[model samples]
Structures are given as structure tokens and as C-alpha cells.
Target: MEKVREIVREGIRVGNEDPRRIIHAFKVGLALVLVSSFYYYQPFGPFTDYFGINAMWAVMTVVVVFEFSVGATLGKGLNRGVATLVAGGLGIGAHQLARLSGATVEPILLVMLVFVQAALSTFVRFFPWVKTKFDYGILIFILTFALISLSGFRDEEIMDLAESRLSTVVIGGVSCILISIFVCPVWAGQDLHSLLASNFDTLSHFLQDFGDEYFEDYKVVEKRKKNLERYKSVLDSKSDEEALANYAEWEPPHGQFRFRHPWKQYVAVGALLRQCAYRIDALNSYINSDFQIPVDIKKKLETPLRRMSSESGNSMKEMSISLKQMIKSSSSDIHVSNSQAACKSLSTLLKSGILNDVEPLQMISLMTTVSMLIDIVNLTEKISESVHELASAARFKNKM
Candidate 1:
């Protein structure tokens, strides 16, 4: 009994885990069983032969339409359904035209159909509205129409063929929709949220490292360089972020989200992050430059600059931590304390003739570095504000 119990426990842990994969496997298996039963059992009784080999077409549709995520499955299934319907209608119209015109007109209609499809395909692709949702569906529509037209030219039972194909496609699309929506759905919105959270985490790490990198030894600097380089992808992901946000907008409310969630604001946050990254890059170039500030000015500037760096880095890290534990009570309680104060103090001191004896070149270089630091602090604050806005919105939802 003890051994049996242990075996059962192991089985549950290994086999029952991973609902997403399990659900997908179950959906495919169930779809196959249904399609096979319809083909072989002929549950339609006297009308059994009506389905005939079209059951295989239904099976193919299920296989092609179902996807790992709910959004993808829904998008593909709808596209296929729309394409099939449009193609079926167009095929019937073309058949009617051919029947009226005779054999000579039949060939002309075929050629005309091909030419019209090609032109419409090219034209529709230019419309941004249609391109986003139904671009692939339109192409599928064109191919389906062409195939039906060519087949009709040879077979006299063109209408019957169109009806059967359309029915099979509808069956497949409906099956995909029901199975995907009901069986442990994976939402694109959830994925986008995870992605945005990770981007914040990466930005925070990069910002913190940027502040302390100037004082690090050679080996530490090299390691830091590699780490920062890893974050460059996050900085450059504005377009990807926008695309994900757009997809997320189409997703129904799930998880902690509600209707009308402001997913588009994520793009705004990505833009702010890009701005901060630019300033950090400018600071990096100055630090890596060959020019050296006078030792006296460097000593005077060290304390304030380091303090500003530490404060700004800490604020960014705090924002990142808050974003990760988003449901926490204090997640939106960010305090990006005046990191610019230190930079301002140093700037005032410079005007008091402290750097008057320093060479003009060194003075200019130091001032440039100081200006960049001020810019970094300002940009960091802007990013912090954007993050706070997002967090506050999320937190408001929790309260409601």
C-alpha cells in the first residue's frame, strides 16, 4: 500500500503538472477522436454520406487553427472562417457567370478571377486596418477561390464541392474556438504583462550598474560591460513592446486585469526607458574618454557625484522591486528623492572659482561630464514617474 501510494504521488507530480501542455494534448486528441468518429461511425445516420471524405478536411482545419495561446488560436480560426466564407461566395458567383457564358466564357471567367484576385490581394495589403487582422486570411481567401474556380472548370458539381469545403472549414474553426477557449486558456495579455515586468527589472539593473561603473576596477568594469550589453536588447525593444501592447489590447480581461485596461501605456514606459538609456550611453562615452579632469576638481566632485549616483540607482532598483511584487501594498509608494540636488550643489561649487586655476580643456570636459550626470538624473526621474503611474493604475485595480 505504501509503495502504491508513493507511485501515485510520483505520477501526479510528473504527469499531472503543466496544465498548458496537458490541455493542448487533450484538445488535439479530442479533436482527432471527434473527427474520426464522424467519419467512421456516421452518426448522421441516413445523411452519413453527406460528410464523406470532408471529415478529413475538418481534421486538417483543427490541426492548423489550434495554437498554444488563446489569442493566436482565435486570430487564426477567425481568419480561416472569414476566408472560407468569402471564397465560397465568390466561387458560387464565378460558377454562375461561367454557366451563363458557355465554354469560351468559362475560360475567360477563370482568367478574370485570377487577375482580380491578384489585384485585390496586392491592394488590400496596403490597408493598415486589414493588414493587421485579415492579411493572411485574404491570401487564404485568394488561394481557396482560385482552387475552387479551377476545380469547377473541370467538375460539373462545383456548387456541391464549395458547400462541402465550407462546411468542413466551419466545423474545424468552431472546434478550435471551443477547445482553445474552454481548455485552460493561455492569454496574450498575461504574456505582455510578464514581458513588461521583465523589461522594468532589466532597466533597473542597468541603471544601478551605470552609476557605480565609473569607479570599478578593470575586471569589474569588463564584467559590468557584458552585463550592460545584455540589457541593450531591452532598450531596443520599443517596436516589439508596442506590438505586444497592441495584441494585449485585443485580449479579453483575465488575471488581475479588467475591461479597458490601459495596456497602451506600456509603450510610453518603453519610450521613457529608451530616453534614460540614451543619457546613460552619453555618460558612458564621457567616462571612457581619454581626457582626464584635474585631480583637485575630481576630488571636489567625487562625493556629490557618487552620492547622486547611489541615490538614483537605489530609486530605480526600488521601482523594479515594486513592479515585481506589484500586488504589495507599497508597490506604488515610490520616492525618487531629489537626486539632482547633489549635481546642483557641485555645479554651484564649480562657479565659485574652485576650478578657475584648472586648464580650459579639463574644465570643459569636467563640466560636460557634470551636465550629462544632471541629464541622467532628470531622465531617471521621468522614467520613475512613468513607472509610478503604471503601478498606481494597477494598484487602483486591486483596491477596486
Candidate 2:
């Protein structure tokens, strides 16, 4: 287990922490797929011998625009771009390898990769050193599944069928690479990185403030809520276009709301908790480090910190709201209702101690980044679990 964790740690450190790379991988995958598709289908025929290259060009352009427009906020240009290229290349290489191997045993290899990726990803989650590599696990899982589906049945006859379609196989392999990369590029540049970084920065600062603020601190979680009213006031008085422009800058503040249906409710609740995590990070960071007071002022800061942490937990109540909706949607009750509370408590505890410790403010800033990353992992875990539950529920005779 320890060794497995080490491996995962290494992978994550190389890949996941910088999401831009993941996005880049997806972009490359998409580009390759378009290229291969054009070569195979000759989609437009005579006029276009290869539509794939054109497709790649189109995708690249759109991705560039998206980054320049919105995605660059994450401040992960190098990470995203490198991730995309490596992953995309791997995807392509895997395809080429599969093509060259021409062995009926490819499915066996594919299955092995899946297990390896899954095991590695699970192990990676436990350690900070390699947390990011789980993204590779995700990509591997996706690619392996595609291989299995494409490879088809295990019988000798089935194997023969796969081997015989060598040309199609090559095309399919290329498509797989493209598919993985096209959808996400990890590091195109700093545009999306800036957005993510700025937002994360705001969130980290906010969390810090909550951790260190006084009753009088304007940045405290409660105080910020009060201050937002002023934003709303200004928004209301502004021209519609101006208001929309401002709205574009500040992510919508998390708000309480009732939902219409079970699925939507669950989704909404998930979104809520995600927002809660973000807001809590922002509050914690801002309070703990960004706002400063004299050395003498540090002694009295604990009270406000505790208060803000507690309130942040309350704000996180929405996670339960969505979980309930998920259970209801599936027509099954979750046995561990207490898990919701535990989830919030555990998350806050992690963030508060590791992510928001304000005494050594620089340490807290670093932790804020770490905590935000953990929150993302937690979010992904929830999504996967929820999806698995839904899949299982679908297998049952009744909705339950």
C-alpha cells in the first residue's frame, strides 16, 4: 500500500495539481481524433483528403479563444499545456503500440492498465506528494475502457476479428488518442490559469480572513455576506449592461435555494457544497493571511476564526440537501445519513488546520492551495460515487 501510494503520489505531482495539463491532454486527443477521422472517413471526400487536420486546427483555435476569454484565469498555462501534450502523446503512442502489437492479447493488457490506474489513483488520493497523477489514472481508465469495447469479446474468433481489421484498428487507436486530448487541455497558457488562480486566490484569501478576522473584520464570512448587499446595491443601480459586466467578473455568490426535482436537487446540492468549499477557502485565506494585524493583535484572532469556521460548516449544510435529493432521486435511502455531517466536519477540519492555520501566514497560504486541491478531489470522488450509485440503482428492478 505504501509503495502504491508513493507511485500515485509521483503521478499526481506530475499531472493533477496543474489542471491545465489535463485540459491540454484532452485537446490533443481531440485534435488527433479529428485528424484520424478525416484520414479514415475522408468525410468531405475529394475536396478534403484529410478533414482531421482541419478539425485539429478548428479545435486549437476554439481552445485558444476559450483560454483567452475565460479559461486563462487559473494561472496554469505551463501546467495545462504540458499536461495536454504529454497525455495526448501518450494517447497517440498507446494507439500506435496497440496497432503494432497486433496481438489478440491487447485486451488483456488494456484490462491490466485499468486495474493499475485505478489502484494508483486510489493510492494517490491518500498522499499530497502525488495527488495530481490521479488525473492520469482517470485518462488511463477512459482509454482502457475504450480498448476493451473496441477489442470486443474474449473468444478466439472475436480476437481474430479484431486482428483482421488492422486498418480500422489503427484509425480507432488514433481516434482514442484524439478523443482523450480534445476534450481537455491541461496547460494551454495562463488565461484559464489566471481565472482559476484569481478565483482560488479570492477563495484562499477569503478563507484566511475568516480564520483570522475579528467580529469587526469586514472580510469575515458573515461580514462579507453583509458587504455583498452593498455590491447588490451597486449592481441594482448600474445599467443592465454594466451590471452584467460586473457579474461576469465575480463568480455568483453561493446562495440558498429550493430545487424542483430529485436529480436537479442533488446536482444543485453538489454545486452548493462545491461553492461552499470555494467560499470557505476564500474566507479562510483572506482572513488568515491576506489581512494583516500587528503581532499583538494575533492573540485575540482565535475567537473570530472559530466563529467563521463554524459558520462555514453551517453554510456547507447544502451538501446534505443534495445528498438527500440524490437518495430520493434513486428511491433509496442512504444508510449513513451522518456521513453528510461527517463530510462537512472532516472537510472543515482539514481546511481549518492544514489550510487555514494563520499564525505562520505563509504556511497558511500554501495550505490554502493544498486545501483547494483536496476539495477538488473530494468533489470528484463525490461525483464518481454518485454516478456509481445511479448505475447500480439502474440495475435494480425498481427505482430503488
Candidate 3:
């Protein structure tokens, strides 16, 4: 059972919330219903065996075509095509069971059988780790089952109906597993550890970008004000929704204006002034040490003062190593805490004799970069806190 559950989770990841999965499930389910209906009654009835068989075969073909086309469109490769083939096979097996036994259960009971298969698929996709689409698919399946079976939960006849449809359940489940394992390629090579590494990487990039901007230019802030004000002017003339629509339309102009704006240029100058210290430190460190570079290593020492910058380049490598260690120390919670600790480290480095050891211009540039990074990190914390609050509120409302 645990093994079965694990398989379901994997299937969920490949399917995502694609309509093809839902439609395929329904087609297979309805086919079972029709087959079971035919098994109980015979030739020349309102719903003949031939009628059920032909209609289901047509539906199965349509589902296969749609799954292949749409899955390709959604970048799922052969996963969807294989899933439909497997589901159809299961439907046929289920129909054969009904014919042999001359027993048919309710549609809801058949759906329950399908749900169990889906649950197994969910388990397969999410057992050891979680993926975005896999997680969403699991939630949809769980919620759909709960909603559909809400009233039937208290009924004993429904329970018996499910018990009688045991063969159909087994057919659906075994086929789904066989198809997924044999046909679908697993993309489990992606691990969350990379995200942890990249978060700190982004932090360092943020600092570097800020340092460069501050040491080189001081006009960006004014440019932002002008850009926002232009949006505000448009907003004043219309409702929030209307303003947003217009703002999107005008984004190109806003983007261009930021690059040319005088106040923004002034802010850029300030940033350049501040980042002088950082630039020097980065230059010296790259030539001297062996710290892991998160991004393009070649680009790290590509400064204007190439020779002097490369002189003690190893120091920059040390800073990168120190930054990553500090980042890792506070990584458990993906919140403000991690960035906050980083800010503290930058402050200590700034006050320390480390800056004095490097070129004066580089020390000034580095300090400015670190300061801007701290500000940005603080802003990131606020944004994350707000998102958490919103998510909590939504969850609470859902329960109600």
C-alpha cells in the first residue's frame, strides 16, 4: 500500500492541473459505467453491449489523441499519452470483469475505484519530494473526492457498492502503475537543495548589483519616483483596475524613462560612490583566494582596473565563502531571518580592519553595496511576511 501511494504522487506531478487528466479519468470512468450497464442487460436493449463498446472505444481514441497533443503542448512529453493508453486498457479489463461476473456497481462506486488509482498516482509523484504541479494535482483530487463523496459518507449501501467493485479497482490501479513505470520518464533529478543554494546566490547577486549601481550611478531612485508618479497620474484618472490595465500598456515607456531620468542618474551616482569599497575588495579577493563562485567566475574579476583588481582577487572569494556560510546558518526558515543575519555579517565586515587592508576606493564601494543589500533584504522580509499572512487567511476561510 505504501509503495502504491508513492506511485500516485509521481503521476500527479506529470499531469499537473491539465484538463486532459480529468477528462481522461471521466472517460475511463464513464466507459466502466456503460460496460457494467451492458453486462447486466443484453442484445437489443436501450443500451446494447455493442453500443457501450463502440461508444467507449471512440471516447478512448479521442482521449488518447487529446492527451498526446495537449501533453506535448504543456511540455509533458509522453507522460499523458502513456497515461491515456493505460487508462483505456484498465477500462477494457474492468469491462471484461463485469461481463464475467454479471455484476455492476453504481457510478459513484466506480468513481471511488478511479479515485484510489489517482491517489496512488499522487503518492508516486510526491513521496520523497514535492513538485509544484504534483502538489496541486493531489489537492484537486483530494478536494474533488471529498466534495463528491460528502453525502455518500454516511450510507452503508454505498460502502457495499464499493466493495463489490473491487475487481474494477484492481484493474484501474495495476494498469496505471504498469504504464507509468514502463512508459513515463521520471524527472526526479531536480532537488530542492539547489533552491537553498540559489537563494544565497541571489542574495550575493543582489549585493553585487546594488554595489555596482551605487558606486557607478545615483539617478535610479529619482527615475523610479518619476515612473511611479506617471503611473499614479494615470491611476488618478481611472479606477484601480483600469489604471493597472493602462499601466501595463505604458510599461515600456516607464522602463525606458528609468534609464534616462536625471534624478535616477543622480541616485546612480550615489550608488557608484558607495560601491567603491566593494569593487576594490572584490578585485583583490578574486586574484588571491579559492572560494566557490555561484555565478560566472570569469566575470567576477572583469573590472576596469584589471591588474590591480586581480592583485588580491582571492579576498572576494573569501567573502563569497563567508556569505554562503552565514546564509546557510539561517536557511531553515525561508524568511527575513536569513537575510537579517547576512546584514549583520556585512556590518561587521564593514567596521572591521578588512576594508582598510583593501584599496580605499574598493572599500567605500563595498560598504555602499552591503548597505543597499541590507535594505533590499529587509524589504524582501516584509513581502514574505505579507504573503504568509495572506495564505493563512485564505486557509482559514477555506475551513469555514
Candidate 4:
């Protein structure tokens, strides 16, 4: 009972994390039903008489092919289909080539064929091109199955086996593509877009009144605790973005995105995003550093720094919202430029002796955080340009 409960809870969590897994499950079931119709129903039941006892091969396609990502769906399915055809065709020919003899030469031929067939494919799988593009395990399993089936069956039925397997597999692939076209399709490009927006929101959330949490200090402080965790998430997002971009490259053009979609631009955007993440971490360490401080100088640094970080945070906040809704308004322009205004004020206050020379050395942490916030303005500009490029190339809305 405990094992059953644990297994059930695990499944619940998996489906909860991404509702798409549950939806993917239903698609696999429905895809199985479509192929199963050939065996059980009349409209498609003609396949049983003409294609022999091979409807199960179609069942194998959805069982073997279905996965969460669209790229994974097509990747395994395409590799599965091509590998089946090659091995099946080769298996048929090997059986025929063995039949040219009647004097117990057949077992010798079967042994010879199996040995060389497995050996050739074994080394072929080692080649970089075949190993990377096609799945190594699937090809070997497919080829080995074909070889074993031919070793046991008649030459005639082997052809029956080969043809129906290829036929139904192709039909299953078409059904999957159609299913993908209409069902709750999850595109890689969409995930990358959301990731960028979410990362922007994370930075904005943490930067709000930048010193509020750290300046006062804390005993874990729930919301601020989670915000720092989100900071780490953006730091670790490089590999995640790499995978999403690669998958996005493989995605077929849909809705706003065309075949010529600028998926690679996401890499550069993520590049700049991580660079800012590192700089943010540097600022985080200053609070963690516990260096000397003067109360009077901090009093002056506090206001301009707060407004500077706040203004920029609001700009990023608005930028992410624009990406989400794909819109721009005068409101967004205000926040964008207001950040620069605050940044300029910070420079004016810092320069020309806002602090006495001796006091400036004690509170140099002020210059560090403020300069980083200033750099944020420049990074934010690049982000806007990268996002603008993505919007135009990805065909996001222009007006309002």
C-alpha cells in the first residue's frame, strides 16, 4: 500500500509539473486507438486481410515514438521509422540469400548472415554521424529483432512482415504529425520565450528597492529568500536555454513564428541575461561581505540607489509584460527612460564630492552597487534591442 501510494503521488507530481505530460498520455492512447482500429474495426479492418498479422507494428510506433517535446516526438519517431525500414529490408534480403541452398547450408548461411549483419551495424553505430543523428539503441534493437524474426519465419511471410511494418509505421507517423498539429501542442520556441520573460521578471523582483532586504538584514525572510533562489536559477539557465534553442530550431513554423524564425537570437539574449546574472551575484556578495559602513554616508546613498534600482526594475518588469502580451505603450516608454533619469541622478550625486574623501573609502560599497545598477541600464538597452529583433523576426505585434 505504501509503494502504491508513493507511485501514485509521484505520477500526480509529474503531471502537475507540466499538464502537457497528461495531455501527451491521452494523445498516445488516442493514437493507439487509431492504429488499433485496423485490427478491430471494419472501415480500417481491411488491413488485417491484406497486410497480414502486422497491425501490432503500428501499435509499436506510438509506444516507441511519443515523448514530451515536439523535437523528441519527431526525433525518435523518424529514427524509429527509417531504422525499421532498413533492417526489415535487409532482413528480407538475407533470408532470400540463404534460400539458394537445400543441403543444411541454411543454418550456416543464417549464422553467417546474423554474424556479419550484427557486426556491420555494431560498427556503423560507432560512427559519429549515425550515433548522433539516429538513436543507437533503437537501431540495434530493431535490427536484432528483424534478424531473429527472419531466422524463424518463411521468406514469403517475411516480406509480409516487412511491408506491413513499414506501411503501418508510416501511417502512424502521419497520424502523430496530424495529432501534433491540432492537439495541445508544446513548442520549444514558446518555452524559450517564456523563460526569457520569466528571467526578466526574476531580476526585476530582486532589484526592487535593491537594499531593502539586505540593508535591514534578515532571518531568512520568506519572499526575499525565494527571490535569491530565482537569482541562482537565472545563473544556471545557460544549458536550459541551449536545449530550448536547439529544440526550437527543429520546430515547424507555427502561428506567429515562421520557418525562418530567429531561434538563435534567443542564445544571444540568454547570453546577455546570464552576464547580468553574474553581475547581480557580485552585488549580492557585497551585502554578504559584511564590510565597514558609515551611517551618514549610507543615508545619502540609500535614496538615489533605491530609486535607480527601482526605476530600472520597473522597466524590466514592463519589458517582460510586453513580451508576454506583445505590446508597447507610452507607459512602457516612461519606465524605460525613467530608469536612465534615475541612473543619471545617481552619477550627479556621486561625483563632485557628495561624500568627504575619507568617508568615500569607508562606504565604497555604495559605488559598487550604484555602478552595477548603472551597468544594468546599458545591459537593459541590449536586452531591448535583442527583444525588439525577436519581436520583429518572430512577428510579434507592433502597435499599442
Best by TM-score: 4
Each candidate's clash count: 0, 80, 61, 0
Tens digit of lDDT per residue, candidate 4, span 1-400? Answer: 9999999999989889988878887988887887787557757336545545456666777677766677667666677677777777777777777777654787788777777766677777788766645644457445645554545666576677677767777877767766765788888778888888898898888787355754565755665566568788899888888878766776677777777877677788888888888888887767656674655566667777777677768777877886767664335457657777877777777686867755556656766777787888778767876676667655566676
TM-score of each: 0.78, 0.23, 0.25, 0.80
**RMSD of each candidate relative to the true structure:** 6.8, 22.7, 21.7, 4.1
Error of 2 at 62 (Å): 3.2
Model 1 residue runs over 4 Å out of place are 1-53, 153-156, 182-184, 217-225, 287-299, 321-334, 340-353, 390-400
Best first by TM-score, ranked? 4, 1, 3, 2
Question: Model 2, range 143-239, lDDT digits (tens) per residue?
Answer: 4344434444443333333232223333333443334334442222223223322322333344334444433365456676643432223213223
TM-score of 3: 0.25
After superposing candidate 3 on the true structure, give the runs of residues whose Cα lies further than 4 Å from its correct spot: 1-74, 103-112, 128-220, 223-400
Model 2 backbone overlap count = 80
The alpha-carbon root-mean-square deviation between model 2 and the true structure, to one decimal in Å, is: 22.7
User: For residues 110-187, what per-residue lDDT tens digits would candidate 1 score against the true structure?
Assistant: 778778887888798889888876777887788778877876345456777778887788878777777767767777
Model 2: worst 10 consecutive residues (lDDT sum):
252-261
Model 3, range 1-400, lDDT digits (tens) per residue? Answer: 9988889997787578455555555544554454445445543645322213343443333333222222121222123333433444554444334335433454445466657767786676676433422343344344333332433332333333333233233333333333333343121111111222233233344334433432225675664443233222321322322222222221222211232222222222223222433433443343233532333222332232222122112222222232223221222233345445555654554465543445555545544434434444444444334323432332322221
Name the runs in model 4 displaced over 4 angstroms. Answer: 1-18, 48-53, 86-157, 209-211, 217-219, 292-295, 328-336, 357-364
Clashing pairs in 4: none
